[PDB]
Here is the input.
Amino acid sequence: SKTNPRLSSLIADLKSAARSSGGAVWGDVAERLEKPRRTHAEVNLGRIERYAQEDETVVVPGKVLGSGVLQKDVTVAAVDFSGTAETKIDQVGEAVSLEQAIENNPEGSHVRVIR
Amino acid sequence: MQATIYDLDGNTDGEVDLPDVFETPVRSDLIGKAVRAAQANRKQDYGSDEYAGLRTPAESFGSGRGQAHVPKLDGRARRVPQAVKGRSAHPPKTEKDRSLDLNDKERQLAVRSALAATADADLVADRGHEFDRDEVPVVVSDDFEDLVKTQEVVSLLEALDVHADIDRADETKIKAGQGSARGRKYRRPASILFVTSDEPSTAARNLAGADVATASEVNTEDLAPGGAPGRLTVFTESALAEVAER
Amino acid sequence: SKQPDKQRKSQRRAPLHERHKQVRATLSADLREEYGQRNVRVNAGDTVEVLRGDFAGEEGEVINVDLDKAVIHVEDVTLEKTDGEEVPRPLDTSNVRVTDLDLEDEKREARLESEDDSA
Amino acid sequence: TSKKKRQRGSRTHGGGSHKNRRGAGHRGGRGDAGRDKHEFHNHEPLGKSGFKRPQKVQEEAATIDVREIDENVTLLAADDVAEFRVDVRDVVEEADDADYVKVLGAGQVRHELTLIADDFSEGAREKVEGAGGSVELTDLGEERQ
RNA sequence: GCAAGUCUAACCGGAGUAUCCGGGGAGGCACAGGGAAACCGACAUGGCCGCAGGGCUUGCCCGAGGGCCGCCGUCUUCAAG
RNA sequence: UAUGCCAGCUGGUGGAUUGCUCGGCUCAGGCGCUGAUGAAGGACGUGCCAAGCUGCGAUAAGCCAUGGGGAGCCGCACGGAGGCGAAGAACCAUGGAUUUCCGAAUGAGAAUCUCUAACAAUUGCUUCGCGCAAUGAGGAACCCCGAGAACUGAAACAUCUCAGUAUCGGGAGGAACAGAAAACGCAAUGUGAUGUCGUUAGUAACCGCGAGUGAACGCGAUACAGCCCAAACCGAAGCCCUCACGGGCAAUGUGGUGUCAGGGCUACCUCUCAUCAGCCGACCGUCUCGACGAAGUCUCUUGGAACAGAGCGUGAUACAGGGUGACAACCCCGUACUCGAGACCAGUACGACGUGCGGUAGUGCCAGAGUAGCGGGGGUUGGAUAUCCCUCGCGAAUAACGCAGGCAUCGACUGCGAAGGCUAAACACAACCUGAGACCGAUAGUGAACAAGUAGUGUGAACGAACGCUGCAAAGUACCCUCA
Ligand SMILES: [Cl-]
Ligand SMILES: [Mg+2]
Ligand SMILES: [Mg+2]
Ligand SMILES: [Mg+2]
Ligand SMILES: [Mg+2]
Ligand SMILES: [Mg+2]
Ligand SMILES: [Mg+2]
Ligand SMILES: [Mg+2]
Ligand SMILES: [Mg+2]
Ligand SMILES: [Mg+2]
Ligand code: NA
Ligand code: NA
Ligand code: NA
Ligand code: NA
Ligand code: NA
Ligand SMILES: [Sr+2]
Ligand SMILES: [Sr+2]
Ligand SMILES: [Sr+2]
Ligand SMILES: [Sr+2]
Ligand SMILES: [Sr+2]
Ligand SMILES: [Sr+2]
Ligand SMILES: [Sr+2]
Ligand SMILES: [Sr+2]
Ligand SMILES: [Sr+2]
Ligand SMILES: [Sr+2]
Ligand SMILES: [Sr+2]
Ligand SMILES: [Sr+2]
Ligand SMILES: [Sr+2]
Here is the structure.
């Protein structure tokens, strides 16, 4: 039983999208976010660096942390970013919230789920 | 955004920038958590006498006289929990920690989130307050801090169309239950919170349900009585600024 | 204290000199203006007017003042016993109002008039 | 509603037969009782092993992996730039209450680094130099003979 | 909630004076392990499968997580295991 | 339909329930010794009528003074009679008077009385006379010094554990104890009296190496404060009693010097501002107590009663709480603001008197013995070779020396001077004062809201209940009939 109202709306949004638009990643991300917090992702830059490719939004069904180096110009969408992750990322790419990703890409196309 | 400033007559006297904090996403779960902690942390440890019911050499005859093996003394049962005058099996204990820890970051995020709830007239109206404005919080000239008479503040609140909320609090409730036997016979609605910066407004504090606070130490409970976000606030131009850095 | 039990206790167990204040009554409008006080310690001799009981409306002279039970007897404010004898029905000074004062005592009079103590 | 709260009416509160939740017999003894008999399974076996050197004759080195130093070069703008030069002793936390600072070779060195520490590992050197870097021992580091 | 960090304890200052606001990182746990000890000190990825999800010209690619291996540190070691 | 069954009704019995709280329980702050000048406790008295409680002591619910207070009063306790008070009573604060007997109990004895001047007994001083003094006993716990279990855990049990606990003996104070290094040993070009709190840490160490037991240095805080002798070199330059005279003490050393920034002596330099002795003597703050203290008792309705409903109005640096015939900021107490007093902080801080700091050179002049240390036997401890202590035995050096740095010896290195002493503050407790409460609400909460340690049980040690609620006002039932 999530207690955070925001995480709760974000989930309702992801669903509305996956159902209305051609989403599936969004419904897949909502699925995981509905599971308990220990299962949510905690990803450091190093991993996003190792598997991300330009022109393919990285979607982390959790929170992005700041260990390691990110040089690729990638747009990372996540539930949250640590103050440092958002900073290190903005230097080479763009950090956006899933609320925005669903906004520009309700069809959830050209995306890479990273955990 | 921008917030309109008011002179002690109720007329607009320019305006200033509403600090970013007031943009903090209102978070009622974190707020209620913070308020839950403050309330618990002022509760007093208690518990019954450790020896209550134990002051007796009462013993149990055991088998033999057609009676249950209950400790008796002078023919009366004693000590045991099922005995009238017996000890209390699992009573309240002084040793119990009745406090609640709250990570400073989680708490500060709650104070900021509560601050933000203040700038939402809809939220404020939802919480129950009775006012007739569109802009809230209500910002006032620093000279507000110089008012001395309570009624000088009433006029200003009527001029600001905020006095109705005080009319709301001007109706105490006589609670149901024994609280009254322990001095808790009354309770009244929470109304306007005045946030100044130099000193708590002695002029406003006696107003029905009014709470006075200073910008450097105004807390979650001030901004959200009982964990309910969106209290009808009235900041002082200077207080508004100091609050920006909490 | 703020706790009810104590509040009542101090009232119920107050020494005698501290009981004079339990027999104080509000002063009439004229008398308030004349002595800068809102109320006064009801004395045997003062004239008072009942503002609340079954006798509200009536006026008479204060015949007795009991600090022990903190009540007063006012002329004609009485009850009739079964044998017919007419006995006084005690009044609480907060249900009464002083309209005329007895100032035969140089001391009392000086007190009311002074600005400091509120006789 | 919690488990506890649902117990009224159950009689045994989950303990099974009411002849169960009594004294220490139901636990097979108090504390670790039976650790070498009935409740012997999953217990460090009985024994006495090794020895300990006196605490004031022990040395606690402060260590750091090249990977940590490398991943933060640019970030360490307050630590020299030449043909980066870094005095580890000024990087590693816990360096005060430590006998000496050692650089370990875990990870990659994607820069030309000139490192200054009291000690390095064979692999730490190989990596730093292999990147056109150098390694310099402190004077304390002179205790390497 | 915060995140390669995280939390302060005693206590200090303020105040609306047991609440609360600020301060305090001593110290704890985590950030490297193996070895009784001396001492030594690691994969920011090299290969193959492949779930979800994405892409495409609708079987074909990309495939986090996961799976099977490689290799790396150390202890024991004539090596090896 | 008798005896009778089931349910209800009316009335009992009973006292649950609801509502109420004069009592509890817990937390917090403050404060903290009494006694031979006879305490604490107890007995017996003491009132117009008086059994219990409370008070008091043959001056007996009281006497006197100063201040406060005030028209009323004569306790709990609402009766009757009578009295006191403007000669200012009651009541409150402070100070004083009186204060039977037993009681440490002290002239001797004794179940609270008796018998023929009494510090009994043990001490110090001593005019060697009880002449001047001391001890005794009490106190809620806290504190210091000694004596010291077992149930229990180990699933038995002996070491171990429970536990240096329960309990016992002795003793101090308002706090105790500790305390200015023969320290530490993050080993150092480092720290710098002692408690305590947080941590170091369930780490090191212990241990049928089982169960279990269990520090320290350091660090962060609290609070901070350092000094005095013995001896050397001086040698009566001195101390106590007494108004004095005079007496007592003291060469077996009073008094000066000095005390590891070693000191003393000799010779110089310079200087005072350290220290030590003593004088004056708070601010503020905290706790409690007290003075002052705004504004409706307006209308209509209901009611036995308006604090209710409806309407009109007001204060607020005061909308805490209580009282008042029902829900009260404005009827009464009080509450905010402001002010005063006492206590504690504290005979402290500051200020001031006196004193004199320190440094150079020479000088083997001085520096705590059954000690340091070793062995036999024990206890205790985390202390393991390396804890602390007791007991029996043996037993050193002299600063050019000695001790410590977790086995012993020798050297080096670093630290430090034991075998004499004092020492504020920060910390424990809760009798006592005040405050507080998501505590209980009369089979609860104290054993005790009442007669409560009461009534009552036991030879005694000891044990030990139950009992709260008329009404707005006693208006607490006149007169009449019946009836012994
Ligand atoms: Cl990661
Ligand atoms: Mg009980
Ligand atoms: Mg109820
Ligand atoms: Mg007057
Ligand atoms: Mg077991
Ligand atoms: Mg056993
Ligand atoms: Mg102590
Ligand atoms: Mg065994
Ligand atoms: Mg040590
Ligand atoms: Mg009872
Ligand atoms: Na008892
Ligand atoms: Na507690
Ligand atoms: Na006291
Ligand atoms: Na004598
Ligand atoms: Na009244
Ligand atoms: Sr039998
Ligand atoms: Sr009385
Ligand atoms: Sr009475
Ligand atoms: Sr049992
Ligand atoms: Sr076995
Ligand atoms: Sr540190
Ligand atoms: Sr923090
Ligand atoms: Sr993998
Ligand atoms: Sr000091
Ligand atoms: Sr010495
Ligand atoms: Sr050695
Ligand atoms: Sr009963
Ligand atoms: Sr017997």
Chains A and C do not touch (no CB pair under 8 Å). The helical segments of chain A are 5-20, 25-33, 45-51, 83-90, 98-104.
